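re: that complex we talked abt at group meeting.

here r the seqs, copy pasted straight from the sheet so there may be weird spacing, ignore it
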Amino acid sequence: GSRRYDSRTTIFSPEGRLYQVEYALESISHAGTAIGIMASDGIVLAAERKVTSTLLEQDTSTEKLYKLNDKIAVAVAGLTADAEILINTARIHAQNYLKTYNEDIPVEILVRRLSDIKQGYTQHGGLRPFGVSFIYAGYDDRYGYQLYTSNPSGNYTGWKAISVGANTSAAQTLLQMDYKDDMKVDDAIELALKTLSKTTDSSALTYDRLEFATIRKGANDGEVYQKIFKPQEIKDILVKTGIT
Amino acid sequence: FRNNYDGDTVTFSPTGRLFQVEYALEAIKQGSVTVGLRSNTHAVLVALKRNADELSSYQKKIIKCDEHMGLSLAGLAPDARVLSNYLRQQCNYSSLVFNRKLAVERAGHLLCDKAQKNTQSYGGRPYGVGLLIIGYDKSGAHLLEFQPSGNVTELYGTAIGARSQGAKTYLERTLDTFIKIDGNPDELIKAGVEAISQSLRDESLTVDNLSIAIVGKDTPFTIYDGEAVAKYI
Amino acid sequence: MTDRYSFSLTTFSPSGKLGQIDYALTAVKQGVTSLGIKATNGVVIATEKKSSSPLAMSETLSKVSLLTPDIGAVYSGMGPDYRVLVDKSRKVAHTSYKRIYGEYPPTKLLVSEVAKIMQEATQSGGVRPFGVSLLIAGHDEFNGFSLYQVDPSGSYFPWKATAIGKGSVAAKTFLEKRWNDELELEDAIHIALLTLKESVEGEFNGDTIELAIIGDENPDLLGYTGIPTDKGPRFRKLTSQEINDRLEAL
Amino acid sequence: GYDRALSIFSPDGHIFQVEYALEAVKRGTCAVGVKGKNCVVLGCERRSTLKLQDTRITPSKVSKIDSHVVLSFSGLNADSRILIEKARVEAQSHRLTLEDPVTVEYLTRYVAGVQQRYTQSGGVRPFGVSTLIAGFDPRDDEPKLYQTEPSGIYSSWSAQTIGRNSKTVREFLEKNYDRKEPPATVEECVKLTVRSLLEVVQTGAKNIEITVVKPDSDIVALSSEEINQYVTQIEQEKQEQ
Amino acid sequence: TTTLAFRFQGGIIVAVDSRATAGNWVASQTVKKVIEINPFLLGTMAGGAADCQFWETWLGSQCRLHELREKERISVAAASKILSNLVYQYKGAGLSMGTMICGYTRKEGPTIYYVDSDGTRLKGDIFCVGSGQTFAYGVLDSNYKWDLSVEDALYLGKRSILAAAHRDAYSGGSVNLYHVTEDGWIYHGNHDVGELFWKVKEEEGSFNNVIG
Amino acid sequence: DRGVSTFSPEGRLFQVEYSLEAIKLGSTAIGIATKEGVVLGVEKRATSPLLESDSIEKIVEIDRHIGCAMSGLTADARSMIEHARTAAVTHNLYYDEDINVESLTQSVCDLALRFGEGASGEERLMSRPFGVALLIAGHDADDGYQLFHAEPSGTFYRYNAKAIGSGSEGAQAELLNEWHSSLTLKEAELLVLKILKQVMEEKLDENNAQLSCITKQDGFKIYDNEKTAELIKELKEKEAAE
Amino acid sequence: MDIILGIRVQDSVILASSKAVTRGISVLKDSDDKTRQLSPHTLMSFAGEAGDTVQFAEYIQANIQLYSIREDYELSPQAVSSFVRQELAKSIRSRRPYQVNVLIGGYDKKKNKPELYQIDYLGTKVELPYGAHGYSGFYTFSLLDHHYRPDMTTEEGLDLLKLCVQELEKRMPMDFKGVIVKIVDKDGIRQVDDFQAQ
Amino acid sequence: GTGYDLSNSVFSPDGRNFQVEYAVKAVENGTTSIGIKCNDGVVFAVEKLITSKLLVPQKNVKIQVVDRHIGCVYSGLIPDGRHLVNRGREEAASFKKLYKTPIPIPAFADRLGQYVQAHTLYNSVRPFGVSTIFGGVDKNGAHLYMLEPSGSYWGYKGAATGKGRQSAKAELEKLVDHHPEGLSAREAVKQAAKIIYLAHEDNKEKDFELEISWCSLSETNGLHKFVKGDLLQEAIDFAQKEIN
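got the structure back, here u go
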């Protein structure tokens, strides 16, 4: 029969842990680092592009920061392809909500739905889990700026500052060291870059190896604006903060 | 060896054996003894009912399938219930659709095929019970032996279960004698009780311990238990 | 019967590796080299027609395929896997796009569809990943020219130029030397030929090399006239003769 | 399609997947519940493996199933969401057909059934979760506290605790809770609850949340201060000796 | 058919006729249009004979299942809703039934629910259902007081069905009475109109038209 | 691995046998049938003094004339009880009469072997056998008071008295000597209480043990604590009497 | 049909619904409340097909309460009406459509403004100062087109309704047995028990 | 490595399907059975071991008919044989229903062939434990066939399988050589009875029962029929006589 070749991706270890989730997490830990920092007037998302080349087209590239909504975006740490499958269903869920209630989807509802999809691959179906961890950056009129994180287990939590992928331990300690409740978007932008700068497994931290995004509520308007920085823009903010 | 080829019914051993089927057959051997024999006018079933405690009952081993057909089981009782139920339905279909009583020979073919399906597919298991089928149809008295392997055979008499070998040799000896017990049921039954007792060893067939069933020319398949079998002990 | 293999065949190992995908990549590594170079007014993709016998007609076997009139694909790895992928790609371009918007899909989206198909062979039950890496070159009005690589995992990335397969490491190094953001299509074709020569052991000519480009529209390849807005496909496979003419200027 | 029997018997008569499911519970943060004479209190501990969270949005441990019943747990967080959603749906369905909200036992019996079912269905692993369900039956003032576990087993308790170090805190409750005189007050009930958690939380004003549930859908969660105040009065009872 | 049920000081009175028809053919004069779901639950029947009988007997089984499951007597509200929701599933299929679910529960007190095949479910103090309903309403409405004595209430209900049996060609046979208190229902006999009419006429001096 | 419906070389189904082992670890349950009714008693066995013992339901009603006691993985018994209640109520709807105790038992046992990963015989969707045994007691016109033992194997035996659970081998021995065709309901009660007391680790009292019976006259009833407390006291006295 | 009316004044939305439930030749009930509270600040009235009416109201109520519990938040009136519209729009193309018309009156605590939504069984939704379903609208729209004012107080709104109910009790063929009036504002939903003579 | 023989559709390093090969063992361990093609028909004979005197003689028939013109006999696991015949019957009924004409022997052979080959394509099924000899008369002659557990089959002049297949084949080869012109149905029946007797030496321990059937354009009108009474005994004797 087939039973012989079944890995049984959804069983408990004698210690009550889920093998595949633990191994998927191990996979994630080797992924480019992604950081999320929430400020009083906005949120910052930054990620390190794992592996690059002279010939890689950075202007047309995007492997870590995706727009899910006009008010929500995510930073990815793990298998890009797996992430894309989840990102697309997340985009659909957001539109179903909008069509049903004629209101943008509250950040947590969307994060919970995505986390639930992941949880499923954990309890039934016999399929491998998604090797992905997300950092959600969004805004809604009930909780304002919010930062969440979800991983292969389907568990999710909220943060003021968080990191996923490689060297999160070092990154977290640095963040927990300089973060301050009354920070400001610009302060956060700088904190994010400094942290990545000290955790990178690379020589220096250049712009061609980064992706940046911010969600601010442009004072001159009154609405929320997402901004996925362009190559040049990253190069700039890189010199200003003193990393050149 | 074996251990590597007895994991499921969909695997042949290097010598062409099906161990799961053979292990199922083992459930029969571990089952209480039952005997069957027929003349030209009747067919009889005699079975030794086994009990758990002296506080428990002696589990029935004879199931009526239709006014003209019935059987005795040895092994997993639930599997007998399933198979006899399928037999009850096939007998029923024959009457309702064709107004025809099902031929014992056909009943045997149907059972063989139903068991065969659980020996070539993954996920299922062979049936773990043996059956002795008796009946009177348009060609007289009949006795069939059903094995979980799907093998069904027509005999003048036979026995299955633990120590069944005793009763079987006895019948193979008494053949020329009982095969002629026509027109006399009591004799055929007695001849059956004598064959069955040839497999005793533990105790002796008592009243609430012996079970007999008969069918024939002008006798609808009926089961006798307890006081009803007293006159045969 | 009935596929009872409803569980994944690719799972995470203690180290976090996805074995089957890793192995699929190793298959791609043994495959014949293929590359793609993007110019300012076009893109060129090429590979070697490694005929498996002189009795075989290498023309009846195309490693470079048209997906849409403005998009082409080439590969490295398991040829059969590629063939079915091309069939599925050509069809998804219709079912998921042309039949909805009445126009062919932009390169990035079709690449996205192909990548999805490949990711599923990485998680669905009862299957193994595709043993190939594709290079997809194309053009679309709002994005211009582009070149993409799609790996067995389903991951894809945009390239200025690159190579996959057998001698990809050396070929990539050679491309990094000759590439610049001002190359004209003919220049890229030339650099493409030079790069491919280092990977070819035996004969190197228009009959052993397969090369196509995505450039200007070919009204002569449209099949009809009378509709101004329809100027023809941008995808064109070079002829054996067209290749040789450029080899003399090698 | 997938229907492999994951929860099956072993030679000793155990079902290891359900057993290992319990191990996932032992690993979860501790949760406790004690019933007063006119209320039931639910306390949970807050991990500290990583601290820099946004408490406003991060999902809380005590969840309202309906306006008169709450559910807390120990184990896999992702799994608990599934059980809570099904409970909430069953609660509304019950109001819809019976025209009366669920009793606490009914709601418990339902959650437990879902857990049991996942222990003998093909293709699924048991829930690595144990719950404490408390509240007041419609129009009733008698407090209710139940506990469910991976196997599908459930029962009511005067007070109970689940999760890591629940062994320790149960001992505390077994020799600090008198059925003769249950915490006759919302205050002394919340105090007995905090005391029990301190036996294992090891000084954690922000590492201990509490929710008080009174009759007629009167449910409220205490703030850091309100709790921190109880801790304070508690550490003095000690020093004053 | 004529059936009624009304609430008053002494609980609930339930009265029904016993005539079954097949058009203008009197199929029977001795049919039971009241079903005893349990010691404290009654159900009345009007409409399709089979539909009423079959589904109300089924309702009984559902109520019994509730008691085994919840270790508690089912409420009148929930019992009436089981039937109401069942019937609603069949809306459009042609089921035909005008029903009343009457009972007592410490939690609800005397309770009456009108439930019909259209899916309508109504709680109320007075209901008359069936082809003869209006005739019953005429007598019942003009003599009803919340403060009727159990004796007087029982009689009004009986007299109302009698009114209906007289004027409605499709109602008749006998009158079956019931009284519901918190100790359950109490059967109050089968009264044949054949004798009940003349008796009531003489003793009451009503039905002054008919010549006797 | 190995199929959930595989035979051992001895002709036994692994999963069913292992199932029986789990039932051995269960709380004790005892049933005694007399021409005056059948008594069913069980060891509550709470696992902590904080657990409200009366919320331990190991004796349940199937119908007014049929009661049930369980032992083993008790959570596994819920669907069985539900199936039984439905079968009993359904039978009454279809036939305007009570379901025979044997018929009810046979129905419950039909669920037993309905397990597997795709057994060719119907649609047995249940990953494993039940891990609980049941004592089904009741009364019907044709065969009077009866007690049945339903196992995960699908076989059900009828007993004059029977014990299941951790102290069964011991308790069964007791029942062997104590039972006789003329026991009164009262004798049966004390007898159940007595034997439970012998096998139980805890000192038997009205809170960690529970009695119940089924009589043709009043049907299945679960004795409230006060009623059993007196029966316990009455037992202690008759024992000390000699 | 039954009378279902709604009027949005300055700081509240008032809903008036007839009390009669008639079948054929008989008025079976005269105290029927054709309303369901969907959330503390959102009320829905309904009229239509005999059984569909309540089944739909209760089904919607069940869903909103579920959302409230799950999100520990109250959906805005606009959000709830959009949800209701979609349900009806699905229904109209189903096997057996819900034949129910509704009025949704809610007080949006975030905007601090009352809102009245009229939605028919086809899923046709519109937001209005005042609305009605059935034949009622034929006498009340022009009446209100004349007497209605934006800045009216809740008390003025009630007098305006009284004017409507009187017109209906004068010209409508059916005896709808008066109406039950409910007010939805910043403090919730309350029923004006005294309209039988206000 | 090893273990290539534990799952049905697996190719061993030498390109074999070991489970099919083990199926063959079950066949060689079975009773002997044969088939003989004559000038206008075919004859089928089989050995029936008399386990004991209890077996009612002549009652446990082994040869099976398909439609009205085809005979089938097999050696190996009897239940598997019946299974294959049931399929053949459904298969023949289907062909007749659509094309009106009863199914041609070649066509029928492939129906059994494809079905049997199908049982060597998946590990969820076991191969057939029988080699089947079958045939009959059709629009253009007589046809004899033998189908192996692998699904392999060919047309035969004579065929045998089971315990004594070698003796039988030896005998069949003689007949083929000494009768290039063709044997007759009458002759074939006797010759078949002889070969079964000769081939019974590889099991001479247990007594047996002879069973013959035939389908001849002239002797049976093209319909499959069993050999009974006088014609049977006459063949039994012809054997008993040449067995000495």
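couple things i noticed - Chain C touches chain D at residues 4, 6-7, 125 (CB under 8 Å). Residues 212 and 237 of chain C are 4 Å apart (CA to CA).
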